[PDB]
Short mmCIF file of all heavy atoms in Angstrom, two decimals:
data_model
loop_
_atom_site.label_atom_id
_atom_site.label_comp_id
_atom_site.label_asym_id
_atom_site.label_seq_id
_atom_site.Cartn_x
_atom_site.Cartn_y
_atom_site.Cartn_z
N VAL A 1 47.09 136.73 30.62
CA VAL A 1 47.43 137.93 29.98
C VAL A 1 47.58 137.74 28.44
O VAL A 1 48.40 136.90 27.99
CB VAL A 1 48.76 138.53 30.50
CG1 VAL A 1 49.32 139.56 29.55
CG2 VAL A 1 48.58 139.15 31.88
N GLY A 2 46.79 138.47 27.71
CA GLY A 2 46.61 138.24 26.32
C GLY A 2 45.26 137.73 25.87
O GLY A 2 44.99 137.64 24.70
N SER A 3 44.40 137.39 26.84
CA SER A 3 43.06 136.89 26.49
C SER A 3 42.25 137.92 25.69
O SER A 3 42.16 139.10 26.09
CB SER A 3 42.28 136.52 27.78
OG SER A 3 42.75 135.30 28.35
N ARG A 4 41.70 137.48 24.57
CA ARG A 4 40.72 138.26 23.77
C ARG A 4 39.36 138.23 24.44
O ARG A 4 38.67 137.20 24.38
CB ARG A 4 40.63 137.72 22.37
CG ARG A 4 40.18 138.73 21.42
CD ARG A 4 41.37 139.79 21.15
NE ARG A 4 41.19 140.65 20.01
CZ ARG A 4 40.77 141.97 20.05
NH1 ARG A 4 40.44 142.46 21.22
NH2 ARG A 4 40.68 142.64 18.95
N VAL A 5 38.84 139.39 24.91
CA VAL A 5 37.59 139.49 25.60
C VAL A 5 36.85 140.68 25.00
O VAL A 5 37.33 141.51 24.27
CB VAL A 5 37.85 139.73 27.10
CG1 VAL A 5 38.69 138.68 27.77
CG2 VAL A 5 38.49 141.12 27.36
N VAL A 6 35.60 140.73 25.51
CA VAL A 6 34.75 141.94 25.34
C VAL A 6 34.48 142.51 26.73
O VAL A 6 34.34 141.73 27.72
CB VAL A 6 33.42 141.53 24.63
CG1 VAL A 6 32.40 142.68 24.65
CG2 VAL A 6 33.69 141.04 23.23
N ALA A 7 34.39 143.82 26.86
CA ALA A 7 34.30 144.41 28.15
C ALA A 7 33.35 145.61 28.22
O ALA A 7 33.21 146.36 27.27
CB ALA A 7 35.70 144.95 28.59
N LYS A 8 32.74 145.75 29.40
CA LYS A 8 31.82 146.92 29.63
C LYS A 8 32.64 148.19 29.71
O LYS A 8 33.71 148.32 30.38
CB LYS A 8 31.00 146.68 30.86
CG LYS A 8 29.88 145.57 30.73
CD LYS A 8 29.03 145.45 32.00
CE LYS A 8 28.04 144.31 31.93
NZ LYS A 8 27.29 143.95 33.15
N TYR A 9 32.11 149.24 29.05
CA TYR A 9 32.61 150.59 29.13
C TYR A 9 31.49 151.49 29.54
O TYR A 9 30.44 151.51 28.88
CB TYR A 9 33.17 151.01 27.80
CG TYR A 9 33.50 152.49 27.72
CD1 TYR A 9 34.72 152.90 28.21
CD2 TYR A 9 32.57 153.39 27.23
CE1 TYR A 9 35.06 154.21 28.20
CE2 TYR A 9 32.95 154.76 27.21
CZ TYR A 9 34.13 155.13 27.71
OH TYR A 9 34.52 156.52 27.73
N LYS A 10 31.70 152.27 30.60
CA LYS A 10 30.62 153.14 31.14
C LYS A 10 30.86 154.61 30.73
O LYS A 10 31.69 155.34 31.23
CB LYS A 10 30.66 153.01 32.65
CG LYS A 10 30.06 151.72 33.19
CD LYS A 10 31.10 150.59 33.37
CE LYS A 10 30.72 149.63 34.53
NZ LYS A 10 29.34 149.03 34.50
N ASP A 11 30.12 155.02 29.64
CA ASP A 11 30.34 156.28 28.98
C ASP A 11 29.33 157.20 29.55
O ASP A 11 28.18 157.41 29.01
CB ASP A 11 30.15 156.17 27.45
N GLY A 12 29.67 157.89 30.63
CA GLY A 12 28.69 158.55 31.45
C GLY A 12 27.65 157.58 31.96
O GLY A 12 27.99 156.81 32.87
N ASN A 13 26.43 157.66 31.41
CA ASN A 13 25.29 156.95 31.95
C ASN A 13 24.88 155.70 31.24
O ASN A 13 24.27 154.78 31.82
CB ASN A 13 24.09 157.92 32.00
CG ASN A 13 24.34 159.10 32.83
OD1 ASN A 13 24.62 160.21 32.39
ND2 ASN A 13 24.28 158.92 34.22
N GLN A 14 25.28 155.60 29.92
CA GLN A 14 25.00 154.38 29.20
C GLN A 14 26.14 153.37 29.42
O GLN A 14 27.19 153.69 29.86
CB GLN A 14 24.74 154.71 27.66
N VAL A 15 25.87 152.15 29.05
CA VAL A 15 26.95 151.12 29.05
C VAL A 15 27.06 150.55 27.67
O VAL A 15 26.07 150.31 26.91
CB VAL A 15 26.53 150.01 30.07
CG1 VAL A 15 27.48 148.81 29.92
CG2 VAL A 15 26.73 150.59 31.51
N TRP A 16 28.31 150.32 27.29
CA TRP A 16 28.67 149.90 25.93
C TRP A 16 29.61 148.70 25.99
O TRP A 16 30.22 148.48 27.05
CB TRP A 16 29.41 151.05 25.12
CG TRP A 16 28.66 152.29 24.96
CD1 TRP A 16 28.66 153.38 25.77
CD2 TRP A 16 27.79 152.59 23.89
NE1 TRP A 16 27.78 154.30 25.25
CE2 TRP A 16 27.23 153.87 24.10
CE3 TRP A 16 27.38 151.87 22.75
CZ2 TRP A 16 26.33 154.43 23.23
CZ3 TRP A 16 26.47 152.45 21.87
CH2 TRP A 16 25.96 153.71 22.10
N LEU A 17 29.63 147.95 25.02
CA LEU A 17 30.51 146.70 24.93
C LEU A 17 31.50 146.93 23.81
O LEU A 17 31.08 147.18 22.66
CB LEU A 17 29.66 145.45 24.73
CG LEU A 17 28.67 145.06 25.82
CD1 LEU A 17 27.83 143.74 25.45
CD2 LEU A 17 29.27 144.83 27.19
N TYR A 18 32.75 146.75 24.11
CA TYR A 18 33.87 147.00 23.28
C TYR A 18 34.95 145.92 23.46
O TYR A 18 35.00 145.35 24.56
CB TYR A 18 34.53 148.36 23.56
CG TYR A 18 35.03 149.04 22.36
CD1 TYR A 18 34.18 149.80 21.52
CD2 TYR A 18 36.35 148.93 22.00
CE1 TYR A 18 34.60 150.43 20.41
CE2 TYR A 18 36.81 149.61 20.86
CZ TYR A 18 35.96 150.32 20.06
OH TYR A 18 36.38 150.95 18.90
N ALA A 19 35.77 145.64 22.45
CA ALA A 19 36.65 144.49 22.53
C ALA A 19 38.02 144.95 23.04
O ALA A 19 38.41 146.10 22.91
CB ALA A 19 36.86 143.88 21.13
N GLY A 20 38.69 143.99 23.61
CA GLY A 20 40.08 144.27 24.04
C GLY A 20 40.90 143.03 24.44
O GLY A 20 40.57 141.89 24.03
N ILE A 21 41.94 143.32 25.11
CA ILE A 21 42.95 142.35 25.53
C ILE A 21 43.16 142.52 27.00
O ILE A 21 43.21 143.63 27.49
CB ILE A 21 44.27 142.54 24.68
CG1 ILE A 21 44.10 142.40 23.27
CG2 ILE A 21 45.37 141.53 25.15
CD1 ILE A 21 43.96 141.00 22.79
N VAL A 22 43.28 141.40 27.68
CA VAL A 22 43.63 141.43 29.12
C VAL A 22 45.09 141.72 29.31
O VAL A 22 45.93 140.97 28.86
CB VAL A 22 43.34 140.05 29.76
CG1 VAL A 22 44.19 139.92 31.15
CG2 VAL A 22 41.85 139.80 30.04
N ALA A 23 45.38 142.89 29.97
CA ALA A 23 46.75 143.23 30.26
C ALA A 23 47.21 142.67 31.59
O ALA A 23 48.41 142.23 31.68
CB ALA A 23 46.86 144.77 30.31
N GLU A 24 46.40 142.63 32.65
CA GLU A 24 46.78 142.19 33.99
C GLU A 24 45.63 141.33 34.49
O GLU A 24 44.48 141.67 34.28
CB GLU A 24 46.95 143.27 35.03
CG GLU A 24 48.07 144.28 34.84
CD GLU A 24 48.06 145.42 35.88
OE1 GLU A 24 47.46 145.30 36.99
OE2 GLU A 24 48.73 146.47 35.70
N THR A 25 46.00 140.30 35.27
CA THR A 25 44.95 139.54 35.94
C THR A 25 44.92 139.99 37.39
O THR A 25 45.84 140.80 37.83
CB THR A 25 45.24 138.05 35.86
OG1 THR A 25 46.54 137.75 36.43
CG2 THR A 25 45.24 137.61 34.39
N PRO A 26 43.94 139.60 38.15
CA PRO A 26 43.78 140.06 39.56
C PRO A 26 45.01 139.84 40.47
O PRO A 26 45.71 138.81 40.27
CB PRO A 26 42.57 139.30 40.07
CG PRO A 26 41.77 139.00 38.80
CD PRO A 26 42.81 138.74 37.71
N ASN A 27 45.30 140.73 41.31
CA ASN A 27 46.39 140.61 42.33
C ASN A 27 46.20 141.67 43.40
O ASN A 27 45.19 142.41 43.40
CB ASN A 27 47.74 140.69 41.67
CG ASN A 27 48.08 142.07 41.13
OD1 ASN A 27 47.50 143.08 41.57
ND2 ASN A 27 49.04 142.09 40.20
N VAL A 28 47.15 141.81 44.31
CA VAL A 28 47.01 142.74 45.45
C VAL A 28 47.04 144.15 44.93
O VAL A 28 46.12 144.98 45.17
CB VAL A 28 48.10 142.53 46.49
CG1 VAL A 28 48.18 143.69 47.48
CG2 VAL A 28 47.72 141.30 47.23
N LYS A 29 48.12 144.55 44.24
CA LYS A 29 48.29 145.90 43.85
C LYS A 29 47.13 146.43 43.05
O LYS A 29 46.72 147.62 43.22
CB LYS A 29 49.56 146.00 43.06
CG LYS A 29 50.78 145.77 44.01
CD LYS A 29 50.84 146.71 45.18
CE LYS A 29 52.18 146.54 45.91
N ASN A 30 46.59 145.69 42.13
CA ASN A 30 45.42 146.17 41.34
C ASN A 30 44.12 145.90 42.00
O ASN A 30 43.10 146.25 41.44
CB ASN A 30 45.46 145.64 39.91
CG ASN A 30 45.10 144.16 39.83
OD1 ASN A 30 44.18 143.67 40.53
ND2 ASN A 30 45.75 143.45 38.92
N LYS A 31 44.15 145.34 43.23
CA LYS A 31 42.94 145.15 44.03
C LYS A 31 41.97 144.24 43.34
O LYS A 31 40.75 144.54 43.16
CB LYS A 31 42.32 146.52 44.38
CG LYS A 31 43.33 147.50 45.03
CD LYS A 31 42.68 148.76 45.47
N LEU A 32 42.49 143.09 42.91
CA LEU A 32 41.77 141.96 42.34
C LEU A 32 40.82 142.33 41.19
O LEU A 32 39.65 142.11 41.20
CB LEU A 32 40.95 141.27 43.41
CG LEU A 32 41.74 140.45 44.44
CD1 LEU A 32 42.72 141.32 45.15
CD2 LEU A 32 40.82 139.86 45.49
N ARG A 33 41.48 142.98 40.17
CA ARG A 33 40.80 143.39 38.95
C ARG A 33 41.54 143.01 37.74
O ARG A 33 42.79 142.68 37.79
CB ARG A 33 40.47 144.87 38.94
CG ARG A 33 39.63 145.32 40.10
CD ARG A 33 39.52 146.84 40.09
NE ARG A 33 40.79 147.41 40.51
CZ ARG A 33 41.03 148.74 40.39
NH1 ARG A 33 40.12 149.62 39.90
NH2 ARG A 33 42.25 149.14 40.79
N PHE A 34 40.91 143.06 36.60
CA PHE A 34 41.52 142.87 35.30
C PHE A 34 41.78 144.17 34.59
O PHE A 34 40.86 145.01 34.43
CB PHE A 34 40.63 141.98 34.48
CG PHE A 34 40.45 140.60 34.93
CD1 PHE A 34 39.40 140.24 35.78
CD2 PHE A 34 41.24 139.53 34.46
CE1 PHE A 34 39.17 138.97 36.15
CE2 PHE A 34 41.04 138.24 34.90
CZ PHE A 34 39.96 137.96 35.70
N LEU A 35 43.03 144.40 34.15
CA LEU A 35 43.40 145.52 33.35
C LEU A 35 43.08 145.19 31.86
O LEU A 35 43.61 144.24 31.31
CB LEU A 35 44.87 145.90 33.44
CG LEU A 35 45.25 147.29 32.75
CD1 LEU A 35 44.53 148.46 33.34
CD2 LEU A 35 46.72 147.49 32.91
N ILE A 36 42.24 146.02 31.25
CA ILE A 36 41.79 145.80 29.84
C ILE A 36 42.44 146.83 28.97
O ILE A 36 42.38 148.07 29.20
CB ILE A 36 40.29 145.78 29.85
CG1 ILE A 36 39.68 144.61 30.62
CG2 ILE A 36 39.80 145.72 28.40
CD1 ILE A 36 40.08 143.24 30.09
N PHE A 37 43.06 146.39 27.87
CA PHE A 37 43.53 147.23 26.81
C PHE A 37 42.53 147.11 25.65
O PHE A 37 42.50 146.07 24.95
CB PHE A 37 44.92 146.87 26.34
CG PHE A 37 46.07 147.27 27.27
CD1 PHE A 37 47.29 146.65 27.14
CD2 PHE A 37 45.91 148.25 28.31
CE1 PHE A 37 48.36 147.01 27.97
CE2 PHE A 37 46.93 148.65 29.09
CZ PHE A 37 48.18 148.03 28.97
N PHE A 38 41.72 148.17 25.48
CA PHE A 38 40.72 148.08 24.43
C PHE A 38 41.34 148.38 23.13
O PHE A 38 42.39 149.05 22.96
CB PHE A 38 39.63 149.11 24.69
CG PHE A 38 38.71 148.82 25.84
CD1 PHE A 38 39.08 149.17 27.11
CD2 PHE A 38 37.49 148.26 25.63
CE1 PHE A 38 38.21 149.01 28.20
CE2 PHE A 38 36.63 148.06 26.70
CZ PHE A 38 36.99 148.44 27.96
N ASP A 39 40.63 147.85 22.07
CA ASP A 39 41.03 148.01 20.65
C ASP A 39 41.23 149.47 20.23
O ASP A 39 41.96 149.67 19.28
CB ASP A 39 39.94 147.36 19.78
CG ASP A 39 39.91 145.81 19.88
OD1 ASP A 39 40.38 145.28 20.87
OD2 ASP A 39 39.33 145.20 18.96
N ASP A 40 40.62 150.44 20.93
CA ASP A 40 40.87 151.84 20.56
C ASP A 40 41.93 152.52 21.43
O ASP A 40 41.96 153.74 21.53
CB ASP A 40 39.54 152.63 20.62
CG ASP A 40 38.90 152.58 21.98
OD1 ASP A 40 39.49 152.14 22.97
OD2 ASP A 40 37.66 152.99 22.02
N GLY A 41 42.77 151.77 22.11
CA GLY A 41 43.82 152.39 22.88
C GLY A 41 43.50 152.81 24.29
O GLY A 41 44.35 153.35 25.03
N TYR A 42 42.24 152.57 24.73
CA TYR A 42 41.83 152.89 26.08
C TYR A 42 42.19 151.78 27.07
O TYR A 42 42.17 150.60 26.70
CB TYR A 42 40.30 153.14 26.06
CG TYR A 42 39.73 153.54 27.40
CD1 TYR A 42 40.20 154.64 28.08
CD2 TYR A 42 38.71 152.82 28.00
CE1 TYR A 42 39.67 154.96 29.34
CE2 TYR A 42 38.19 153.15 29.23
CZ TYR A 42 38.70 154.28 29.88
OH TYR A 42 38.15 154.59 31.13
N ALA A 43 42.43 152.21 28.30
CA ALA A 43 42.80 151.24 29.38
C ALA A 43 41.88 151.42 30.58
O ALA A 43 41.54 152.57 30.95
CB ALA A 43 44.22 151.48 29.72
N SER A 44 41.53 150.32 31.23
CA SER A 44 40.67 150.46 32.46
C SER A 44 40.64 149.13 33.19
O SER A 44 40.93 148.08 32.63
CB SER A 44 39.26 150.95 32.08
OG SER A 44 38.50 149.97 31.48
N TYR A 45 40.32 149.20 34.45
CA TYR A 45 40.21 148.05 35.32
C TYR A 45 38.76 147.64 35.40
O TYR A 45 37.86 148.56 35.48
CB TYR A 45 40.77 148.32 36.71
CG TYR A 45 42.30 148.24 36.88
CD1 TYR A 45 43.05 149.36 37.10
CD2 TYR A 45 42.93 147.04 36.88
CE1 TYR A 45 44.47 149.29 37.26
CE2 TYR A 45 44.34 146.96 37.05
CZ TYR A 45 45.08 148.07 37.23
OH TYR A 45 46.48 147.96 37.39
N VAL A 46 38.48 146.35 35.35
CA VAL A 46 37.07 145.85 35.37
C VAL A 46 37.06 144.51 36.10
O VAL A 46 38.11 143.81 36.20
CB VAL A 46 36.52 145.66 33.97
CG1 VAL A 46 36.62 146.98 33.21
CG2 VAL A 46 37.23 144.59 33.18
#
């Protein structure tokens, strides 16, 4: 938690790459995914 990464963002039909921070690592509740806090305030699981 805190890793500086780049992450795929699916903006409708195109795919974009944007920077962020790992908020959560895989576990049961999040169904084995990483929670990403992007540099523009957006949040998503990947």
